[PDB]
């Protein structure tokens, strides 16, 4: 009835758009999309990954937000998911049927997890004008977007909580129709958004963080069984979109930044996240954990001494892509507790966050890890084999032990550092959320880019800049929408990658170079 003839397909398409993924019959299509949003862009900047190519310095990988690549990013983050969502809206906007009303609120929840990434990447977006038929939509400021999204999520939760029967289980690749689980995802996204805005607007943060956690409202994601992930299933086969860039193009490798933490912390998640690469061959062949540096400057190489044989993220056609896991919830509460948004020892949520992350990665030895005081490992000159590059990731960097401080920051500031750092490790491979959190808090410290002309390409200086502040809108886009002329005003700066977004906290910490 309703699923096969109206929403079913549009809904599955929406789910696949949040983080680029698709059917196997779509070959490398989605991988090219995941590459633009996560692998060679965001994942590259924060150092989750390393590119075995520089593309002639012609795309987002080396911070060259060209007109074509930015139009593509806009599609991947915003417009692609809008089309099917909008159709779902035009078909159910006017229905007394509480069932179709349940379908539209879930579609909205999905569309928001997506547009959250969009706003955190571009800043102002067309949130409120969404679906008003207008030829040229109106953009809202990142602040309005945030406020509206909060109110809308809150509105989805109210209606969805009154629904007690499985909704479109046949097309729900996320929770299989379980409406209670969608309520949790929504509140969990609320908790995310609220923590995001606390430094800027402490009161807005508190208004929603309460609704998000009030038990009467469904609660948040607290068990691995409630996590939101999408993967291949009988309901809809999928080909993990990371494979194209990892195995076919041989361009995505383990990043120098995350390797640095995993290594120096003696993190058992190292083995779970990446494979062991090779260097050379035969006798003098070394087999270890070799990462590729961020914003690589060297061209693609396929020799036995190249990055083609550096460590790769472990992944196969069945691997899933995560939207929101229990571990994040705990780290969010830790930051929340740390700023009096909720009660409880920031430390208890912190450690528990790590414990859950290990359970999700199937590893163990938490107590030993939490006792560690080792510092992240750096990439000095004669250790980086894929060109010349070095960066000391340990300088002024904290360790896993909650009570172990450096003295370089106030205790409150280091505890946040610890939280965001461990959250960074638990978030993997959610490249866009980690990158957003870096730009917001300044943590965890990252390995500087290798391509020194990178900062310059977006209007910034290498001295401080370790990553772009946002993507810019393709200039030609202004020609079709006379409203975009307002973008810079809504941004508070020019439409370039150097401009900071609304939620960047003041005095964002910076690693000491020494």
Ligand X SMILES: CC(=O)N[C@@H]1[C@@H](O)[C@H](O[C@@H]2O[C@H](CO)[C@H](O)[C@H](O)[C@H]2O)[C@@H](CO)O[C@H]1O
Which spans of this chain sit near ligand X (rule: CB under 6 A)? Answer: 28, 32, 35, 53, 55, 59, 249, 251
Closest of 346, 434, 361, 353 to residue 120, by C-alpha:
434
Q: Using DSSP bridges, classify how beta strands 228-230 and 277-279 pair: parallel, antiparallel or unpaired.
A: unpaired
Closer to ligand X by Cβ: residue 16 or 417: 16
Question: Which residue, 53 or 436, has its beta carbon nearer to ligand X?
Answer: 53
Residue with smaller CB distance to ligand X, 298 or 325 = 298
State the nearest-atom distance from the C-beta of 391 to ligand X, in Å. 25
Give the largest CA-CA distance in the chain: 73
Nearest to ligand X of 249, 273 (CB atom): 249
Q: Please report how close the Cβ of residue 78 comes to ligand X at its closest, in angstroms.
A: 18
CB of 319 to ligand X, least distance (A): 20
Q: How far is the CB of 57 from ligand X (least distance, A)?
A: 12
Nearer to ligand X, 51 or 112 (CB): 51
Cα–Cα separations (whole angstroms), residue 224 to 322, 325, 354, 367: 12, 7, 13, 20
Shortest distance in whole angstroms from residue 218 CB to ligand X: 40
Nearest CB to ligand X, comparing residues 58 and 406: 58
Question: Under a CB-based contact definition with an 8 Å cutoff, are residues 44 and 51 in contact?
Answer: yes
What torsion do the CA atoms of 7, 11, 14, 20 make, to the nearest 10 degrees? -130
Measured from the CB atom, the residue of 249 and 290 that comes closer to ligand X is 249
Q: Which is nearer to ligand X, 183 or 292 (CB)?
A: 292
In whole angstroms, the minimum distance from the beta carbon of 400 to ligand X comes to 36
Q: Which is nearer to ligand X, 52 or 141 (CB)?
A: 52
For residue 253, the cross-strand partners are 50
Residue closer to ligand X, measured from CB, 163 or 246: 246
CA 211, CA 219: separation in Å to the nearest integer? 9
Distance, CA of 11 to CA of 22 (rounded, Å): 13
Distance of closest approach, residue 40 Cβ to ligand X, in angstroms: 7
Residue 24 CB, nearest approach to ligand X (Å):
15
SS3 string, 167-219, reads CCCCCCCCCCCCHHHHHHHHHHHHHHHHHHHCCCCHHHHHHHHHHHHCHHHCC
Question: Residues 175, 182: contact at Cβ < 8 Å?
Answer: yes
Nearest to 431 by CA among 35, 39, 80, 18: 39
Which 8-state DSSP code applies to residue 335?
A: H
Listed residue (369, 296, 361, 303) closest to 327, CA to CA = 361
CB 196 within 8 A of CB 440: yes
- Min dist CB 241 to ligand X, Å, is 12
Q: How far is the CB of 244 from ligand X (least distance, A)?
A: 7
Q: Which of 331, 347, 334 is nearest to 403 (CA)?
A: 347
What are the CA-CA distances from residue 465 to residues 46, 64, 259, 420, 469 (Å)? 12, 15, 20, 19, 9
């Amino acid at each position: 009835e309703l699923g096969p003839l109206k929403y079913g397909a549009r809904f599955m398409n929406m789910q696949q758009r949040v983080i680029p993924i698709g059917s196997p019959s779509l070959t490398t299509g989605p991988g090219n999309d995941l590459q633009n949003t996560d692998l060679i862009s965001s994942g590259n900047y924060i150092g989750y990954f390393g590119n075995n190519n520089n593309w002639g310095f012609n795309n987002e990988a080396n911070w060259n937000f060209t007109d074509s690549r930015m139009n593509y990013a806009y599609q991947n983050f915003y417009s692609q998911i809008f089309l099917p969502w909008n159709e779902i809206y035009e078909i159910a906007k006017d229905s007394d049927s509480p069932s179709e009303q349940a379908i539209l609120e879930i579609a909205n929840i999905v569309r928001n997890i997506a547009w959250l990434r969009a706003t955190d990447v571009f800043g102002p977006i067309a949130y409120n004008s969404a679906g008003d038929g207008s030829i040229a939509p109106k953009f809202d400021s990142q602040e309005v977007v945030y406020r509206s999204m909060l109110a809308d999520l809150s509105k989805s939760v109210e209606l969805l909580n009154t629904i007690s029967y499985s909704v479109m289980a046949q097309y729900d690749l996320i929770y299989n129709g379980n409406v209670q689980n969608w309520v949790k995802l929504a509140n969990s996204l609320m908790l995310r958004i609220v923590v995001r805005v606390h430094f800027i607007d402490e009161t807005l943060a508190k208004e929603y963080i309460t609704k998000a956690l009030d038990p009467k409202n469904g609660g948040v994601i607290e068990d691995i069984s409630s996590e939101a992930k999408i993967k291949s299933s009988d309901k809809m086969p999928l080909l993990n979109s990371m494979l194209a860039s990892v195995n076919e193009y041989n361009e995505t490798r383990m990043g120098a930044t995350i390797w640095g933490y995993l290594d120096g912390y003696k993190d058992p998640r190292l083995s779970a996240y990446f494979t062991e690469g090779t260097y050379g061959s035969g006798s003098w062949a070394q087999t270890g954990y070799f990462p590729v540096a961020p914003t690589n400057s060297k061209s693609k190489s396929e020799t036995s001494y190249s990055a083609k044989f550096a460590s790769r993220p472990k992944v196969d056609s069945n691997s899933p892509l995560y939207w929101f896991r229990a571990s994040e919830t705990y780290f969010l509460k830790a930051e929340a507790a740390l700023y009096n948004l909720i009660g409880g020892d920031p430390k208890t949520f912190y450690e528990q966050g790590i414990n859950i992350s290990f359970q999700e990665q199937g590893v163990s030895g938490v107590a030993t890890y939490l006792s560690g005081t080792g510092k992240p490992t750096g990439l000095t000159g004669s250790n980086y084999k894929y060109g010349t590059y070095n960066h000391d990731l340990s300088i002024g960097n904290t360790s896993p032990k909650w009570d172990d401080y450096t003295g370089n920051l106030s205790k409150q500031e280091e505890q946040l550092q610890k939280i965001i750092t461990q959250k960074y490790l638990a978030l993997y491979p959610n490249a866009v959320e980690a990158w957003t959190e870096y730009r917001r808090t300044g943590f965890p410290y990252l390995m500087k880019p290798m391509d020194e002309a990178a900062p310059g390409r977006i209007g910034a200086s290498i001295e401080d800049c370790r990553v772009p502040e946002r993507f810019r809108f393709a200039p030609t886009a202004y020609n079709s929408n006379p409203n975009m002329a307002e973008i810079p005003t809504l941004l508070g700066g020019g439409d370039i990658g150097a401009t900071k977004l609304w939620w960047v906290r003041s005095n964002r910490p910076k690693q000491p170079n020494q």
